[PDB]
Amino acid sequence: RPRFSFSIAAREGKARTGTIEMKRGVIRTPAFMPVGTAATVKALKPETVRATGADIILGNTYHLMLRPGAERIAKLGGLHSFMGWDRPILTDSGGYQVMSLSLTKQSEEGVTFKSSRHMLSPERSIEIQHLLGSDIVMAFDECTPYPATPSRAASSMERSMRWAKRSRDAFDSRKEQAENAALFGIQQGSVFENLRQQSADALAEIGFDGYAVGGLAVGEGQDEMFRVLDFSVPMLPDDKPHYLMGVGKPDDIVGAVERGIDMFDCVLPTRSGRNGQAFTWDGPINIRNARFSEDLKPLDSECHCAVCQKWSRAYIHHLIRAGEILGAMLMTEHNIAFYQQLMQKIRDSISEGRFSQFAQDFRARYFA
Amino acid sequence: RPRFSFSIAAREGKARTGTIEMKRGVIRTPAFMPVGTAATVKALKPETVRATGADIILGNTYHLMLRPGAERIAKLGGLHSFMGWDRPILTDSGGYQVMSLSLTKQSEEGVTFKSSRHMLSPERSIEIQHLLGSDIVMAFDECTPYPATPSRAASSMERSMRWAKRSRDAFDSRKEQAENAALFGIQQGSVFENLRQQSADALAEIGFDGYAVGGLAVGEGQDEMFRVLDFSVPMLPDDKPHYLMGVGKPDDIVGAVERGIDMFDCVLPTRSGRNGQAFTWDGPINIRNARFSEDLKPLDSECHCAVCQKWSRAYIHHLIRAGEILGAMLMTEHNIAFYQQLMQKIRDSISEGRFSQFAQDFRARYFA
Ligand SMILES: CNc1nc2cc3c(=O)[nH]c(N)nc3c(CCN)c2[nH]1
Ligand SMILES: CNc1nc2cc3c(=O)[nH]c(N)nc3c(CCN)c2[nH]1
Ligand SMILES: [Zn+2]
Ligand SMILES: [Zn+2]
Numbered sequence A, B: 001r002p003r004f005s006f007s008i009a010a011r012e013g014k015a016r017t018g019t020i021e022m023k024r025g026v027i028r029t030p031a032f033m034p035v036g037t038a039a040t041v042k043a044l045k046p047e048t049v050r051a052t053g054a055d056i057i058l059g060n061t062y063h064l065m066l067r068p069g070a071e072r073i074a075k076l077g078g079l080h081s082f083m084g085w086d087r088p089i090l091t092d093s094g095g096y097q098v099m100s101l102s103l104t105k106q107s108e109e110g111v112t113f114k115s116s117r118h119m120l121s122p123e124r125s126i127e128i129q130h131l132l133g134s135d136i137v138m139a140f141d142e143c144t145p146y147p148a149t150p151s152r153a154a155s156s157m158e159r160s161m162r163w164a165k166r167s168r169d170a171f172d173s174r175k176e177q178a179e180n181a182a183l184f185g186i187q188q189g190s191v192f193e194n195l196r197q198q199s200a201d202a203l204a205e206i207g208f209d210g211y212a213v214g215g216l217a218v219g220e221g222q223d224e225m226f227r228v229l230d231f232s233v234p235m236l237p238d239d240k241p242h243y244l245m246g247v248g249k250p251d252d253i254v255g256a257v258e259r260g261i262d263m264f265d266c267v268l269p270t271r272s273g274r275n276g277q278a279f280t281w282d283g284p285i286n287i288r289n290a291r292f293s294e295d296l297k298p299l300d301s302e303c304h305c306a307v308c309q310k311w312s313r314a315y316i317h318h319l320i321r322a323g324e325i326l327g328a329m330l331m332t333e334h335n336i337a338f339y340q341q342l343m344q345k346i347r348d349s350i351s352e353g354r355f356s357q358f359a360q361d362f363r364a365r366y367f368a
Helices: A046-051 A061-066 A070-075 A079-083 A096-101 A122-132 A150-173 A175-180 A193-206 A222-235 A250-258 A268-274 A306-310 A313-321 A325-351 A355-366 B046-051 B061-066 B070-075 B079-083 B096-101 B122-132 B150-173 B175-180 B193-206 B222-235 B250-258 B268-274 B306-310 B313-321 B325-351 B355-366
Strands: A004-012 A015-022 A025-029 A031-033 A057-060 A089-092 A104-107 A110-114 A117-120 A136-138 A182-187 A210-213 A242-244 A263-265 B004-012 B015-022 B025-029 B031-033 B057-060 B089-092 B104-107 B110-114 B117-120 B136-138 B182-187 B210-213 B242-244 B263-265
Touching (some): A004 A325, A015 A325, A025 A325, A061 A070, A061 A096, A070 A122, A089 A122, A110 A122, A122 A150, A122 A175, A150 A182, A193 A210, A193 A222, A210 A222, A222 A250, A250 A325, A250 A355, A268 A325, A306 A325, A313 A325, A325 B325, B025 B031, B025 B325, B031 B325, B057 B061, B061 B117, B061 B122, B070 B122, B089 B122, B096 B110, B110 B122, B117 B122, B122 B175, B193 B222, B222 B250, B268 B325, B313 B325, B325 B355
Parallel strands (some): A136 A182, A182 A210, A242 A263, B136 B182, B182 B210, B210 B242, B242 B263
Antiparallel strands (some): A015 A025, B004 B015, B104 B110, B110 B117
């Protein structure tokens, strides 16, 4: 395969379906990336992640630089070998996570923070992602808190665009990385159209393999997120993938694809699965509720996953109530399979020209 | 298959190897039973338990009567259907576990205890094990604390023998149970030869499908446990299986087989795996130790398990240090596979008449 090739096979309105070909594999789009923040998709073996349909997983610069360490992982052969996932990996650049989880000192050079003193900069971020062996490298950005005033959003976006250029140059200076990995830029500008335009224009001038919509799913709500996507995605190059960072719930995914997004990542299926929340086509359910204690049905009536072929709601209820690890395993496998099935149904419906009908059917049932 | 048939295929000294045939499957002996106290072998799917080589697992009357409840499990189709294990299940009778984990009131009728008020008696125990759908039912006993005076051990053993008769009669009165399940009696008498003889004689007079050595691995130490087995196992009927309850470490298993034991159960491989302890043929290792942080070798150099085929000590070190669920999963799978491999090597070496050499080789290396 090539280092990177995105091909759009079919379209419906703003929605697209296609493939990204990379050296370690093919990614079907629209794609959902399970999140593997500490070099594991929590409670799943990599073979189980792949069995559910995933083509690519997400890793995090921030968590892995802290534990077990980027240099350590490189000495051990890179992240793919370390965790036993041989397919593409996208790594976030840090910076969302620094601001989210760290003590911190921000400057034009980057950010210094407390987990032991650490530092991130465009150059260091790109180098960490190299040491991990990431296939899709994210530019190092600033994720603008919500709400933001226009002045603060603009200052923040402009810094991010200067860091996007530094990210580009750092990646390109590293031949092995430039020849084997891809680089995505991240659009900022909060909820403001003009700032989003300026950011899109800056990123396209630099040129990236893919373009993320950053700065959303940070407190604004679905209506606002959708309003911003409505004008923001069309600003990005049409022939490159569009990645909505940190989204989201099933209905957020459907709506975002209707607005031109091709890639997603979210901890919701893994995290909330461990907490007892199971996704179903009739909406989410909380398996800990007493109403499931003697329910012999599978978590979801249609789901093809191994969990729903073999175990009842009653059993999984028992396991989660008891805090058994197998409860976390089964819930997480089902929720990640559900998300992959949603992405398959989206892909197939766009390929067949019936995605708008699918989105309406989906919503009427999910919210019934 | 028949309800129950034990056949001895080969012998070496006091050691035996053979099969127990039951309706739900064949059990190869000497056998190790992974423990599934809350209707799960912790952190493993039943298919993974079977892939490691297990033929039979252990369930507990005490835990399951509390959560999710014996009547509940019967209404849901029994324990095999509930947890997805279709092969034989042995259930302990409660009583070790009551004394261990419960508030309690003991009388000749049974025991009343605090988890909500609960009660166990020979009759109730056997009925719970029926409701669970156990294949091998344990008589309801009293596990004599260690150390015990001869008087207290004798009183306790005599009560247990009266409860063994009540257990027999309760099981036999229940036709479906008597026709499809097996019943094992449990020898008591602490460390005293004469009391062990009396107990063996009482149990054989009643007659059981198998005979457990109860009252050991409760603080006496390996030398003493082995001293007691030396005289106690020969007292039991030679043509029925001999089950050493709650044992144990790999070397305890080897020594006990040398003394005529055919079946074992222990939480050590599961529990200590979750705590970072991995079994290897060169002895146990604690994977959390810093010396493994960059060790690319598998947990054990010879082990055939899927964990050792795919992941390094360094990765598992990271996962356990981080408290990741996949760490518990991988450690537990390896430790249960190690135990099954030990039992296979024991079986094969007795079949080939070279078990005494195996036991010596094993020990020289394990303790090197
Ligand atoms: C859950 N919401 C959320 N919004 C994001 C925005 C950014 C963002 O604007 N930049 C970066 N680098 N990452 C983001 C992430 C993390 C993706 N796993 C976000 N997550
Ligand atoms: C770890 N040591 C230990 N000693 C046991 C003795 C009895 C015993 O004497 N009786 C019964 N019913 N169970 C025992 C158990 C529980 C087996 N999982 C014991 N476990
Ligand atoms: Zn499912
Ligand atoms: Zn292994």
